[PDB]
Amino acid sequence: PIIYCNRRTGKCQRM
């Protein structure tokens, strides 16, 4: 994929 994930919350997005 070309998206990332938050380290604070722990959730990923779809960009």
Side-chain angles (χ1 to χ4, degrees):
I2 37 61
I3 72 95
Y4 91 123
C5 309
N6 291 18
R7 313 200 78 164
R8 292 80 48 83
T9 95
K11 280 179 181 214
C12 317
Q13 250 280 261
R14 43 67 47 81
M15 289 293 250

mmCIF file of all heavy atoms in Angstrom:
data_model
loop_
_atom_site.group_PDB
_atom_site.id
_atom_site.type_symbol
_atom_site.label_atom_id
_atom_site.label_comp_id
_atom_site.label_asym_id
_atom_site.label_seq_id
_atom_site.Cartn_x
_atom_site.Cartn_y
_atom_site.Cartn_z
ATOM 1 N N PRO A 1 0.816 -1.217 0.000
ATOM 2 C CA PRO A 1 0.000 0.000 0.000
ATOM 3 C C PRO A 1 0.849 1.267 0.000
ATOM 4 O O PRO A 1 2.073 1.205 0.129
ATOM 5 C CB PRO A 1 -0.798 -0.108 1.301
ATOM 6 C CG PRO A 1 0.035 -0.968 2.187
ATOM 7 C CD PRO A 1 0.733 -1.942 1.279
ATOM 8 N N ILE A 2 0.194 2.414 -0.143
ATOM 9 C CA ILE A 2 0.890 3.695 -0.158
ATOM 10 C C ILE A 2 0.438 4.578 1.000
ATOM 11 O O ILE A 2 0.610 5.797 0.966
ATOM 12 C CB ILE A 2 0.660 4.445 -1.483
ATOM 13 C CG1 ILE A 2 -0.769 4.219 -1.982
ATOM 14 C CG2 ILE A 2 1.670 3.996 -2.529
ATOM 15 C CD1 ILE A 2 -1.829 4.712 -1.023
ATOM 16 N N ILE A 3 -0.138 3.957 2.022
ATOM 17 C CA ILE A 3 -0.612 4.686 3.191
ATOM 18 C C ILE A 3 0.255 4.392 4.411
ATOM 19 O O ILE A 3 1.169 3.570 4.352
ATOM 20 C CB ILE A 3 -2.076 4.337 3.519
ATOM 21 C CG1 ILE A 3 -2.167 2.926 4.103
ATOM 22 C CG2 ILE A 3 -2.940 4.457 2.272
ATOM 23 C CD1 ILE A 3 -2.172 2.897 5.616
ATOM 24 N N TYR A 4 -0.040 5.069 5.516
ATOM 25 C CA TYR A 4 0.712 4.880 6.751
ATOM 26 C C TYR A 4 -0.227 4.653 7.932
ATOM 27 O O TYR A 4 -1.445 4.585 7.767
ATOM 28 C CB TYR A 4 1.603 6.095 7.020
ATOM 29 C CG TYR A 4 0.938 7.160 7.861
ATOM 30 C CD1 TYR A 4 1.505 7.586 9.055
ATOM 31 C CD2 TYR A 4 -0.260 7.740 7.460
ATOM 32 C CE1 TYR A 4 0.899 8.559 9.826
ATOM 33 C CE2 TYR A 4 -0.872 8.716 8.224
ATOM 34 C CZ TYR A 4 -0.289 9.121 9.407
ATOM 35 O OH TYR A 4 -0.894 10.091 10.172
ATOM 36 N N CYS A 5 0.349 4.536 9.124
ATOM 37 C CA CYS A 5 -0.433 4.317 10.333
ATOM 38 C C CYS A 5 0.061 5.207 11.469
ATOM 39 O O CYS A 5 1.261 5.433 11.618
ATOM 40 C CB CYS A 5 -0.360 2.847 10.754
ATOM 41 S SG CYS A 5 -0.761 1.672 9.421
ATOM 42 N N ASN A 6 -0.875 5.711 12.270
ATOM 43 C CA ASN A 6 -0.534 6.577 13.392
ATOM 44 C C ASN A 6 0.100 5.775 14.526
ATOM 45 O O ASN A 6 -0.335 4.666 14.832
ATOM 46 C CB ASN A 6 -1.783 7.300 13.901
ATOM 47 C CG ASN A 6 -2.300 8.327 12.911
ATOM 48 O OD1 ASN A 6 -1.964 8.288 11.727
ATOM 49 N ND2 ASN A 6 -3.120 9.253 13.394
ATOM 50 N N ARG A 7 1.128 6.347 15.143
ATOM 51 C CA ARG A 7 1.823 5.685 16.241
ATOM 52 C C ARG A 7 1.157 6.006 17.576
ATOM 53 O O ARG A 7 1.143 5.179 18.488
ATOM 54 C CB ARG A 7 3.291 6.113 16.275
ATOM 55 C CG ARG A 7 3.973 6.060 14.918
ATOM 56 C CD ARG A 7 5.485 5.998 15.056
ATOM 57 N NE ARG A 7 5.949 4.659 15.410
ATOM 58 C CZ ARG A 7 7.213 4.264 15.297
ATOM 59 N NH1 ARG A 7 8.133 5.102 14.841
ATOM 60 N NH2 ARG A 7 7.556 3.029 15.640
ATOM 61 N N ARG A 8 0.608 7.212 17.684
ATOM 62 C CA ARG A 8 -0.057 7.642 18.907
ATOM 63 C C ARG A 8 -1.382 6.910 19.093
ATOM 64 O O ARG A 8 -1.645 6.336 20.150
ATOM 65 C CB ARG A 8 -0.296 9.153 18.878
ATOM 66 C CG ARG A 8 0.981 9.973 18.946
ATOM 67 C CD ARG A 8 1.668 10.048 17.591
ATOM 68 N NE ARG A 8 0.733 10.389 16.522
ATOM 69 C CZ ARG A 8 0.363 11.632 16.237
ATOM 70 N NH1 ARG A 8 0.847 12.648 16.939
ATOM 71 N NH2 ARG A 8 -0.492 11.862 15.249
ATOM 72 N N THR A 9 -2.216 6.933 18.056
ATOM 73 C CA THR A 9 -3.515 6.274 18.105
ATOM 74 C C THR A 9 -3.394 4.798 17.743
ATOM 75 O O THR A 9 -3.944 3.935 18.427
ATOM 76 C CB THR A 9 -4.521 6.945 17.151
ATOM 77 O OG1 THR A 9 -4.536 6.259 15.894
ATOM 78 C CG2 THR A 9 -4.167 8.408 16.932
ATOM 79 N N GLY A 10 -2.672 4.514 16.664
ATOM 80 C CA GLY A 10 -2.493 3.140 16.231
ATOM 81 C C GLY A 10 -3.443 2.757 15.113
ATOM 82 O O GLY A 10 -3.725 1.577 14.906
ATOM 83 N N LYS A 11 -3.938 3.756 14.391
ATOM 84 C CA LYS A 11 -4.862 3.518 13.288
ATOM 85 C C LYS A 11 -4.240 3.935 11.959
ATOM 86 O O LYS A 11 -3.427 4.857 11.904
ATOM 87 C CB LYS A 11 -6.167 4.285 13.515
ATOM 88 C CG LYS A 11 -7.112 3.601 14.488
ATOM 89 C CD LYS A 11 -8.380 4.412 14.696
ATOM 90 C CE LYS A 11 -9.314 3.740 15.690
ATOM 91 N NZ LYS A 11 -10.746 3.973 15.350
ATOM 92 N N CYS A 12 -4.629 3.249 10.889
ATOM 93 C CA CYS A 12 -4.111 3.548 9.559
ATOM 94 C C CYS A 12 -5.172 4.234 8.703
ATOM 95 O O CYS A 12 -6.370 4.053 8.920
ATOM 96 C CB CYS A 12 -3.638 2.265 8.873
ATOM 97 S SG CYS A 12 -2.694 1.146 9.958
ATOM 98 N N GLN A 13 -4.722 5.020 7.732
ATOM 99 C CA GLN A 13 -5.633 5.734 6.844
ATOM 100 C C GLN A 13 -5.612 5.130 5.443
ATOM 101 O O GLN A 13 -4.947 4.122 5.201
ATOM 102 C CB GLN A 13 -5.260 7.215 6.779
ATOM 103 C CG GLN A 13 -6.264 8.127 7.466
ATOM 104 C CD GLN A 13 -7.482 8.406 6.607
ATOM 105 O OE1 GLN A 13 -7.573 9.450 5.959
ATOM 106 N NE2 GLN A 13 -8.426 7.472 6.595
ATOM 107 N N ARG A 14 -6.344 5.753 4.525
ATOM 108 C CA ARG A 14 -6.411 5.275 3.149
ATOM 109 C C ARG A 14 -5.774 6.281 2.193
ATOM 110 O O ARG A 14 -5.754 6.073 0.981
ATOM 111 C CB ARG A 14 -7.864 5.021 2.745
ATOM 112 C CG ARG A 14 -8.822 6.111 3.197
ATOM 113 C CD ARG A 14 -8.549 7.424 2.481
ATOM 114 N NE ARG A 14 -8.382 7.239 1.042
ATOM 115 C CZ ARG A 14 -9.398 7.130 0.192
ATOM 116 N NH1 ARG A 14 -10.646 7.188 0.635
ATOM 117 N NH2 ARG A 14 -9.165 6.963 -1.103
ATOM 118 N N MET A 15 -5.257 7.372 2.750
ATOM 119 C CA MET A 15 -4.620 8.409 1.947
ATOM 120 C C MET A 15 -5.533 8.856 0.810
ATOM 121 O O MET A 15 -5.106 9.563 -0.103
ATOM 122 C CB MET A 15 -3.292 7.902 1.380
ATOM 123 C CG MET A 15 -2.201 7.755 2.428
ATOM 124 S SD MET A 15 -1.682 9.337 3.117
ATOM 125 C CE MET A 15 -0.042 9.493 2.412
#
